[PDB]
Amino acid sequence: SHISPEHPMLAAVVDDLATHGWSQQAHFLPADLVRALAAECRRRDAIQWIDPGQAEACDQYLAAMDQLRLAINQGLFLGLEDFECHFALYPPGAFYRRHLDRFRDDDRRMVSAVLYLNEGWQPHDGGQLRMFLADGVEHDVEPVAGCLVVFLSGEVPHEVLPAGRERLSLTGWFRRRGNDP
Numbered sequence: 036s037h038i039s040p041e042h043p044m045l046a047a048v049v050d051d052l053a054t055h056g057w058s059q060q061a062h063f064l065p066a067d068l069v070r071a072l073a074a075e076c077r078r079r080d081a082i083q084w085i086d087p088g089q090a091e092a093c094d095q096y097l098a099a100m101d102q103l104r105l106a107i108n109q110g111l112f113l114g115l116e117d118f119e120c121h122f123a124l125y126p127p128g129a130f131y132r133r134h135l136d137r138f139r140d141d142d143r144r145m146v147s148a149v150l151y152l153n154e155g156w157q158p159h160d161g162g163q164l165r166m167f168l169a170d171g172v173e174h175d176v177e178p179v180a181g182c183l184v185v186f187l188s189g190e191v192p193h194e195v196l197p198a199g200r201e202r203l204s205l206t207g208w209f210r211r212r213g214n215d216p
């Protein structure tokens with residue numbers, strides 16, 4: 036597909052990355068597309084990297100993230116060559132311990148981006164992404180449908196607290212070429 040879904044202005048995501056190292060955007064994509072992505076997530080659960088030509092919903096997600104790639108390059112000069120992503124479905128009780136996405140070891144992943152897909156999430160459900168920001172500040176993100184979180188991979192440690200219900204997301208990374216051919 037060649038359709039490009041509606042999304043809020045990317046300039047704000049880029050300014051946030053520059054100023055704070057991270058950005059969060061509610062309703063990043065229209066609700067019908069987010070639901071279609073939730074559906075594809077469940078379909079795949081029943082690593083499958085996502086590429087154009089696999090499903091309509093995914094094609095539209097990639098088109099938007101490609102726009103975000105070009106916007107990031109423009110504003111922050113990162114030389115990002117591509118975006119890789121895949122679905123993730125955490126069973127109730129699953130958690131992800133504190134970690135950094137990019138090690139100090141040349142890792143090509145420069146910027147992380149997670150799109151959440153869960154309708155009707157409540158705080159009793161847990162499952163927040165917890166981000167460890169500068170100055171010892173912590174920030175929880177509830178994995179609410181349509182919510183996009185973007186951050187610098189080498190900079191923001193983060194974890195996922197266990198949820199009481201299936202937790203759906205689309206997780207990815209913008210990458211540089213890197214020094215190894």
Ligand SMILES: O=C(O)CNC(=O)C(=O)O
Pocket residue numbers: 123131136149164193194195204206
């Ligand atoms: O799903 C989330 O919110 C967090 N995901 C990750 O930290 C990851 O896949 O590396």
Ligand SMILES: [Mn+2]
Pocket residue numbers: 134135136193
């Ligand atoms: Mn991570």
